Amino acid sequence: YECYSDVSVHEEMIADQVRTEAYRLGILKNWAALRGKTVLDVGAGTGILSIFCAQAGARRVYAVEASAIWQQAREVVRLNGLEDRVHVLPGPVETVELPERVDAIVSEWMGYGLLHESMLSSVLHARTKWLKEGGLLLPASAELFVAPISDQMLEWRLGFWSQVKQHYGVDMSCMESFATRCLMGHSEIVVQDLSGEDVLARPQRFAQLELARAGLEQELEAGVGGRFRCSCYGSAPLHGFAVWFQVTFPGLVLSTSPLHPATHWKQALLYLNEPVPVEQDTDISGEITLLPSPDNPRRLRILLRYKVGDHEEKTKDFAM
Amino acid sequence: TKSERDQLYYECYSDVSVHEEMIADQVRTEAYRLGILKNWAALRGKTVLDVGAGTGILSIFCAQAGARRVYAVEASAIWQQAREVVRLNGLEDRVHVLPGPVETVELPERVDAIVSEWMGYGLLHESMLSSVLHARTKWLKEGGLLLPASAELFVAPISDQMLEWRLGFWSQVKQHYGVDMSCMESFATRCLMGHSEIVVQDLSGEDVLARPQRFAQLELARAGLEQELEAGVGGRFRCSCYGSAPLHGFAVWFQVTFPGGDSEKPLVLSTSPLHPATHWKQALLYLNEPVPVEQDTDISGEITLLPSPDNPRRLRILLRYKVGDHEEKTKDFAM
Ligand SMILES: COC(=O)c1cc(O)c2cc(NC(=O)NCCCNC(=N)NC[C@H]3O[C@@H](n4cnc5c(N)ncnc54)[C@H](O)[C@@H]3O)ccc2c1
Ligand SMILES: COC(=O)c1cc(O)c2cc(NC(=O)NCCCNC(=N)NC[C@H]3O[C@@H](n4cnc5c(N)ncnc54)[C@H](O)[C@@H]3O)ccc2c1
C-alpha cells in the first residue's frame, strides 16, 4: 500500500516500454471486441490502461484501485476528458460494488517469477464476481518457460578473483571457491537480466495458466508447474536454470524471455550449488513447481528437480 | 536490535559481494596502493596494524612497501579467506591475519603505523571510524603514522538532472502514449523530495550549481575526535550560484588524505562528483521542493553529521540553509 501509494513503482512500470507498449497494443488491437463494451480495470493504478481501453472504443471502464494512487487516477481521467466513461472506484476489487457485470477485464498483475507477490488472486476474484460469461480477459493466459543457462555475468564474477593479480599485483585466485559458494550455494531465487547467449538449450514451456478458469485460484496453492526435457546446444558450464513467463492477449504476447527485449521483470534464476560441465546434446530433464511459501503465501517458492545426463537426479528448494 | 544489526553486518562482510565491490572500486583501491607505497620511507622495517583488513589486500600492499610485520585484523568470516590470500602470496611470515574485532585483539607490541579503509556512505554512515580511533589509542606508538591521516567533507548545491527527469516524467507520458499525466507532477515532487531520507546516488559535474565548499576536516590523530563524533561533525558554508537552475538541495561527499609525499600536494582519494566515480557515490539532501535560483544567488548554511539516537552508526544530517533573501530553513535527514 505505501508502495503503490508512492510514485516510484508506477513510474517504473510505465517506464518499462516493452511492458507498457505491449499492454497498449494488446488493448488497442482488440478494438473490435471492446467497441461499445464495458471493462473492469483491476488495480488501475494511475489509470493509464483504462484510458487505452477508452481509446479502443469501450463504452465504459470501471477502474478499481486499492491504494491512495486512486486519487491521482481520478485526476488523470478528468484531465483527459474521460470522466463521462472512465470511473475510478477506490478500494479492493474484492469489496467494490460495480453497477453491472462487465464484458472485459484488463489487469497488469504479474510479479517476479510470475507469481511472487502478484495480484493474480484479485484478478481471479474479479473474474468470478464481475466478468460476464466468456468475457474478454486482457491478458487471457500466462505461459511459464524454463531453460538451462550458462550465466556470463556469474562467470565474470567468479573469475574476478583471478584477475586481481593483474589489476593490483596481489594474487587472490584462491577466492574462487569461496565466491562460488557464496554466489551459487544459497537457496535464493535470483532476479537478473540474462542474455540470449546465456541460454544453453531450447526453452521449454512447462506450465500454462488460463485466467478464465474457475478453480485456478485453489489450484495455485498446490503449485503450478510441470516436467521438462531438453538437449544442450554445446559445451559450457551449466549454472542452473532460468524461469520466465509470457502473457497472451486475445487476438499479441508480452514476453519476459532472455531472447526477447528486456523488461523490468528480468528472469528468475535458479543456480545449482556449483557449475556442472555439459557438452553438446547433453540431455537435461526435470520438474519445476511454483509454490506459495509456508510463512507468507505471497512469497514465491520454486521446487526444482533435475537430472543432468547420466548423473543422479537432484533437487533444490528455492525462495524469493 | 543491536544484536540483529551486528549479525547482519557479520553476514554481509562474510560474503563475497561487498569485497568484490570494494576491490573493483579502482579509484579506491589504487589510491590506497599508491598512498601506501608512496610511504615506503616511513614503513620500511616498521610494524603496521590494518584495521578491518577484509581480504588482506591493503596489508599486502604494506608488506610490498617494505613493512617488517603487518597485523591484519578482521572481524567477519572473511578473515579465513584473507589467511589464504596471504599464504598464496608467500607473505604469512610477515602478514599475520588475526580474527576478531580490533577492540579485543591482542598484539605483541604497539605498532608504528595504522592503515585502514574505514569510510562509509556520507563518510560516517556505518563507518569503522570508532574502531580505528580505538586502535589508535590502544595500539599506535606515540608519533605513529595514520594512513590515511585525515578526512575532509564537502558540500555543493545541486540541480539533479536525474531528479528533474523523474519529476518531469509525468508531463512526458502524453508524447509517448497519448495519455496526459501532467497533473501528477505535484504528487511526484512530494514523494521524491518531501521525505527526510539521505539519498545515495551518483551525480555528475553538470549537477553542481556552485563552487563546492569544504565544511569540515577530521584529523585522525586527535585524541578527542571521539567526543566530537557524538556531538556532531560539520560546519558552515557559503557559495554563489553559477547560473539559473532549479535548486534541488545539496550533495555531500568526502575525501581522505594520505601522509607523506609532497608536503604541499598530498595524495587524496576523492568521492567528488567532479572526479571519477567511486562506489560511495554522493549523499544527496533534497529540499521539500525545488527552489528557483539565479546567477550569483547566495546560499549559506550549516551541515552537521550526527549519530542517530537509536543507532549511533545510522547517519543523521542536520541541514540549516538560507537561499537568497528567503527565510533560513532547516531539514533533518537520516540514512
Ligand atoms: C486496504 O488494502 C489496500 O489498500 C491494499 C492491500 C494490499 O495487500 C495490497 C497489495 C498490493 N500488491 C500487489 O498488487 N502486488 C502485485 C505485484 C504487481 N502489482 C501491480 N501491478 N499492481 C497494480 C495496482 O493494483 C493495485 N491493487 C493490488 N491489489 C488490488 C486489489 N485487490 N484491488 C484493487 N487494486 C489492487 C495496486 O495498488 C497497484 O496500484 C498492492 C496494493 C495493495 C493495497
Ligand atoms: C563478529 O562480527 C560482528 O559481530 C560484526 C559486528 C559489526 O557491527 C560489524 C560492522 C561492520 N561494518 C563495517 O565494516 N562498516 C564500515 C563501512 C565499510 N566497511 C568496511 N570498509 N569494512 C572493512 C572490513 O572491516 C571489518 N570490520 C568492521 N569493524 C571491525 C572491527 N571493529 N574490527 C575488525 N574488523 C572490523 C569488516 O568485517 C569488513 O570486512 C562490519 C562487520 C561487523 C561485524
Numbering used by the authors:
A (entry chain B): 51 to 301, 308 to 376
B (entry chain A): 42 to 376
Quote the original article.
Structure determinations and refinements revealed that only compounds 12a, 12c, and 12f are visible in the active site of each monomer of the PRMT6 dimer. Compound 12a is the only one for which a complete electron density is visible in one monomer of the PRMT6 structure, whereas for 12c and 12f the electron density becomes fragmented after the guanidine group and the density for the methyl-4-hydroxy-2-naphthoate moiety is weak. The crystal structure revealed an unusual distorted U-shaped conformation adopted by compound 12a (and probably also 12c and 12f) in the binding to PRMT6, with a folding at the level of the guanidine group. Whereas the adenosine moiety lies into its canonic binding pocket, the guanidine group of the compounds is unable to reach the PRMT6 double-E loop clamp because the linker with the sugar is too short, even for the longer compound 12f. Instead of binding in the arginine substrate pocket as observed with PRMT4, the methyl-4 hydroxy-2-naphthoate moiety is sandwiched between the adenosine and the side chains of Y50 and Y51 residues of the α helix motif I. Hence, the binding of compounds 12a, 12c, and 12f affects the proper folding of the PRMT6 alpha-X helix containing the motif I (Y50-Y51-X-X-Y54). If compared to the structures obtained in the presence of SAH, the binding site of the complex of PRMT6 with compound 12a is larger due to a displacement of the α helix and the flipping of the side chains of Y50 and Y51 residues to give room for the compound naphthoate moiety. As a consequence, the E267 residue of the double-E loop is not coordinated anymore by residues Y50 and Y54 of motif 1 and adopts a different conformation.
Protein arginine methyltransferases (PRMTs) are important therapeutic targets, playing a crucial role in the regulation of many cellular processes and being linked to many diseases. Then, another series of compounds (12a–12h) were designed and synthesized, introducing also an adenosine moiety and exploring the distance between the three groups. We also report crystal structures with various PRMTs supporting the observed specificity and selectivity. On the contrary, we were able to cocrystallize the compounds in the complex with both PRMT4 and PRMT6.
